[PDB]
Amino acid sequence: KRRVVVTGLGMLSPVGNTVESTWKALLAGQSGISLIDHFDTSAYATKFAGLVKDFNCEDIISRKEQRKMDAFIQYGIVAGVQAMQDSGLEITEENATRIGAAIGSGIGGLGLIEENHTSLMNGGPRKISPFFVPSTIVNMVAGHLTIMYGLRGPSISIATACTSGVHNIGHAARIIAYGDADVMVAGGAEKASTPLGVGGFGAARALSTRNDNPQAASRPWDKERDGFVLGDGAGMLVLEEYEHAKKRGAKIYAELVGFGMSSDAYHMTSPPENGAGAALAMANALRDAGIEASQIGYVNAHGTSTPAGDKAEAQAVKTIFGEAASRVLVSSTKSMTGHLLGAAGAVESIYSILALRDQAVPPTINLDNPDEGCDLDFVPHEARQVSGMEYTLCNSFGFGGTNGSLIFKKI
Amino acid sequence: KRRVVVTGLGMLSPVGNTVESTWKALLAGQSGISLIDHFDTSAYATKFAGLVKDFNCEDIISRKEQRKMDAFIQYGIVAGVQAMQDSGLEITEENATRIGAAIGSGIGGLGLIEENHTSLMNGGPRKISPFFVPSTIVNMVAGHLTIMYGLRGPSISIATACTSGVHNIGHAARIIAYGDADVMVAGGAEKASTPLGVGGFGAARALSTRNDNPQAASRPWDKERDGFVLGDGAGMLVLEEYEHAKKRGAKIYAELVGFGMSSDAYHMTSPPENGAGAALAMANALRDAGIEASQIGYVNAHGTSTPAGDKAEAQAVKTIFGEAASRVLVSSTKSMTGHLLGAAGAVESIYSILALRDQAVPPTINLDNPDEGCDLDFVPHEARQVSGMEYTLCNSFGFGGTNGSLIFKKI
Numbered sequence: 110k111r112r113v114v115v116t117g118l119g120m121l122s123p124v125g126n127t128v129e130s131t132w133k134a135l136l137a138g139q140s141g142i143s144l145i146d147h148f149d150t151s152a153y154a155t156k157f158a159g160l161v162k163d164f165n166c167e168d169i170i171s172r173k174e175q176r177k178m179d180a181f182i183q184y185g186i187v188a189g190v191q192a193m194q195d196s197g198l199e200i201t202e203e204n205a206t207r208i209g210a211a212i213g214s215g216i217g218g219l220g221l222i223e224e225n226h227t228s229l230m231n232g233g234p235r236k237i238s239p240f241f242v243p244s245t246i247v248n249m250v251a252g253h254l255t256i257m258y259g260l261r262g263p264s265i266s267i268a269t270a271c272t273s274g275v276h277n278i279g280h281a282a283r284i285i286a287y288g289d290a291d292v293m294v295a296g297g298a299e300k301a302s303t304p305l306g307v308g309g310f311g312a313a314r315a316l317s318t319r320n321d322n323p324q325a326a327s328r329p330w331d332k333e334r335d336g337f338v339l340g341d342g343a344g345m346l347v348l349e350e351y352e353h354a355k356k357r358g359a360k361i362y363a364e365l366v367g368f369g370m371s372s373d374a375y376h377m378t379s380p381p382e383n384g385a386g387a388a389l390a391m392a393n394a395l396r397d398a399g400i401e402a403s404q405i406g407y408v409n410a411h412g413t414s415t416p417a418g419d420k421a422e423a424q425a426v427k428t429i430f431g432e433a434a435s436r437v438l439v440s441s442t443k444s445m446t447g448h449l450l451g452a453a454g455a456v457e458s459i460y461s462i463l464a465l466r467d468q469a470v471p472p473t474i475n476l477d478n479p480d481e482g483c484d485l486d487f488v489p490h491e492a493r494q495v496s497g498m499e500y501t502l503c504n505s506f507g508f509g510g511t512n513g514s515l516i517f518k519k520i
Numbered sequence: 521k522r523r524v525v526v527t528g529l530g531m532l533s534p535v536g537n538t539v540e541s542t543w544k545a546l547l548a549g550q551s552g553i554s555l556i557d558h559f560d561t562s563a564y565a566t567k568f569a570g571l572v573k574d575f576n577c578e579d580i581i582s583r584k585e586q587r588k589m590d591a592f593i594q595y596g597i598v599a600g601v602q603a604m605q606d607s608g609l610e611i612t613e614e615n616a617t618r619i620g621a622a623i624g625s626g627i628g629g630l631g632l633i634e635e636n637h638t639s640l641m642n643g644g645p646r647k648i649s650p651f652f653v654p655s656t657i658v659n660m661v662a663g664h665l666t667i668m669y670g671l672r673g674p675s676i677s678i679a680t681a682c683t684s685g686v687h688n689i690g691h692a693a694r695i696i697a698y699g700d701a702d703v704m705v706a707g708g709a710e711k712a713s714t715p716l717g718v719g720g721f722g723a724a725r726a727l728s729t730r731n732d733n734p735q736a737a738s739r740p741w742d743k744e745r746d747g748f749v750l751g752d753g754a755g756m757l758v759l760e761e762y763e764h765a766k767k768r769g770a771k772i773y774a775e776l777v778g779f780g781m782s783s784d785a786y787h788m789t790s791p792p793e794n795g796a797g798a799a800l801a802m803a804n805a806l807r808d809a810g811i812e813a814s815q816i817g818y819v820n821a822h823g824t825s826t827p828a829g830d831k832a833e834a835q836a837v838k839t840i841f842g843e844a845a846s847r848v849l850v851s852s853t854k855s856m857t858g859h860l861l862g863a864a865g866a867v868e869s870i871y872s873i874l875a876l877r878d879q880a881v882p883p884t885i886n887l888d889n890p891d892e893g894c895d896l897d898f899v900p901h902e903a904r905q906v907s908g909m910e911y912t913l914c915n916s917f918g919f920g921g922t923n924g925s926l927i928f929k930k931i
């Protein structure tokens with residue numbers, strides 16, 4: 110039996126450009142939400158997002174190579190490098206073959222698609238960049254990373270909307286467990302804060318519209334929720350087989366011990382009031398890990414600050430935790446960070462891992478007045494200190510009722 | 521140990537709207553390539569593609585529901601229904617939970633992205649459809665199918681460019697083998713024959729330009745190759761665990777016995793002249809199945825009719841088959857059908873499965889003059905009759921050097 114452990118972390122996010130900085134900002138209840146200034150938002154109903162601030166990549170990616178790449182790929186690589194550096198792995202010819210990648214995105218290169226389409230509308234097909242395809246398609250984050258580090262193992266990319274993050278980590282472990290790889294770089298990257306991504310979610314009426322107080326917009330479970338808050342970023346994990354990691358003397362952050370997937374079979378964008386799909390994915394993760402709900406100390410919720418969405422997950426937690434529902438800690442870091450779509454599950458896996466390290470649970474800021482029936486401990490305003498927390502659960506749900514959960518364990 | 525078998529086939533393609541029709545057209549060496557007429561191609565360097573002809577879906581999808589869906593999703597569903605109908609599975613409340621889906625696409629809804637972006641350019645963000653997001657994102661084929669049949673098992677979507685098809689089948693089996701599901705609907709759907717998809721690949725100089733003879737454009741391994749030929753379509757497979765399938769008395773088409781993944785670590789679009797990545801993926805598939813190259817009767821090649829691409833794969837076959845390289849049959853059905861990108865690996869899995877059933881190997885049409893060093897039996901012009909063929913191998917390679925292979929076995 111092969112046990113997968115997390116030996117390397119890397120990340121870009123709205124509250125920080127590194128893992129540790131981001132983690133301090135979350136624990137200090139800082140927000141990363143801000144007014145969008147890279148495109149005219151006058152006609153838009155949402156004028157704010159969680160944007161990655163003062164991002165440098167020149168040291169890692171050259172200006173000549175920057176032009177073949179949408180910003181989502183740029184983020185993915187930089188965060189991937191971080192994860193590799195943190196891992197300390199040395200890739201040798203005797204190694205290459207056993208190391209792979211499992212990185213996805215919800216929609217990939219929206220920025221460059223809009224740009225190319227604009228050129229085509231204004232100049233015909235001869236003005237379309239020669240890199241249009243490889244600069245936008247979702248799997249190019251893993252493509253460039255494999256090339257960069259000479260990785261020859263398995264190379265997949267799962268694109269399941271907001272569950273992407275969780276699914277890539279899940280299958281990266283599965284791959285390792287199966288024997289196809291020893292080390293896997295996994296995570297997700299997203300950069301949808303573009304006209305079409307902001308407009309598009311606006312069109313569906315899914316985004317918050319609180320432009321008078323951008324940092325208060327995102328309020329999971331609060332009575333005044335009006336929609337999720339969009340955020341860009343990327344979170345990369347290095348997963349590797351225990352023994353392999355043991356022999357090399359690797360920083361072991363945690364052990365990936367459970368992975369559950371489920372389908373809703375209800376609505377294309379809406380979740381069931383019930384939360385049954387969310388319930389069956391936690392449930393399945395539990396079975397896969399072989400533990401009971403009661404051993405879960407902290408649940409990093411999907412909790413996107415949407416009226417219907419937050420209700421459902423809460424209910425699913427009450428179904429799964431039952432009597433231990435009052436003793437379990439459930440927060441949403443999306444109150445600060447915003448929804449990272451394809452990257453959400455990746456960064457939130459890092460937050461659930463660090464919580465094990467530090468026994469501190471990031472808060473759910475802006476939760477001034479819980480709505481009617483939410484009696485759970487949502488870690489309301491300030492980080493909570495804890496003791497003896499062995500496991501944490503991490504949720505992510507997505508359009509098409511595609512659900513996933515990851516269980517982490519302290520080692 | 522769990523053995524996965526294929527109990528249901530479904531498919532839309534340029535040469536046919538059903539599985540059997542398509543199969544007859546391939547064996548009769550028919551081409552599906554034609555002049556594009558849904559957009560002005562006057563300024564374009566390629567004016568032809570493999571398009572799905574006279575496609576009906578009204579019986580399956582209503583006109584009110586058609587509007588929330590890009591054509592790639594439309595194709596996926598219709599082909600998925602076919603696969604379910606062919607399977608004969610009955611979904612019950614005692615069943616739902618164990619049946620899932622694993623359907624991907626290379627780029628998903630290009631058609632609707634261009635349309636929405638056009639509206640936004642000409643009318644601002646209020647003219648963007650409310651279904652923009654769910655009508656384009658890659659995972660909505662599995663989303664709608666799960667809802668339609670009430671599937672509650674695992675729901676993933678792999679988006680690895682032209683390897684998508686193979687990867688979704690691969691992981692669908694892995695999932696089943698692992699125990700997360702008993703039945704999985706898997707495959708891919710693509711519909712990139714749009715201005716941006718044709719222009720975009722044109723921009724890279726990757727497409728054939730033989731507009732004077734569209735049906736002769738696609739010529740894998742021929743000396744006059746000038747680029748791949750674009751094709752739309754979808755191919756769906758129903759994978760299910762042997763025992764489960766046995767007990768229900770299911771039509772067993774074949775057994776999925778091997779799945780190999782590999783990374784090139786060379787170039788973002790170009791393959792290595794060597795074909796080493798392609799070699800290591802066949803190699804890995806072989807190990808996973810536990811058989812030797814010599815037992816492989818037919819290889820459905822990636823063979824996209826690209827100068828560099830076709831060279832490399834051929835070499836990789838010579839490395840893997842070695843002495844049996846002359847006795848093994850290698851054809852490319854892309855000579856007729858064109859490249860289905862995200863769907864390519866799905867339809868070609870069906871062609872490798874049917875070849876087992878009928879012991880007939882589809883030809884590589886248009887191969888008038890093999891280039892210099894290609895001495896392999898490429899099944900040059902007419903279908904070849906065979907006897908005692910137990911296994912077939914199926915290849916698919918993609919941008920970012922992401923490789924995959926599937927091995928099928930006659931039962």
Ligand SMILES: *[C@H](C(N)=O)[C@H](O)C(=O)CC/C=C/C/C=C/C
Pocket residue numbers: 215216217269270271272301305306307309310413450451506507508509653657
């Ligand atoms: C996210 C959610 N409901 O939690 C949802 O599944 C989703 O739409 C992700 C797909 C988005 C990809 C980025 C595209 C932006 C236009």
Ligand SMILES: *[C@H](C(N)=O)[C@H](O)C(=O)CC/C=C/C/C=C/C
Pocket residue numbers: 242246626627628680681682683712716717718720721824861862917918919920
């Ligand atoms: C396909 C190949 N080289 O065999 C290649 O990997 C690829 O570009 C697939 C990605 C395309 C998705 C459809 C987008 C069209 C614009």
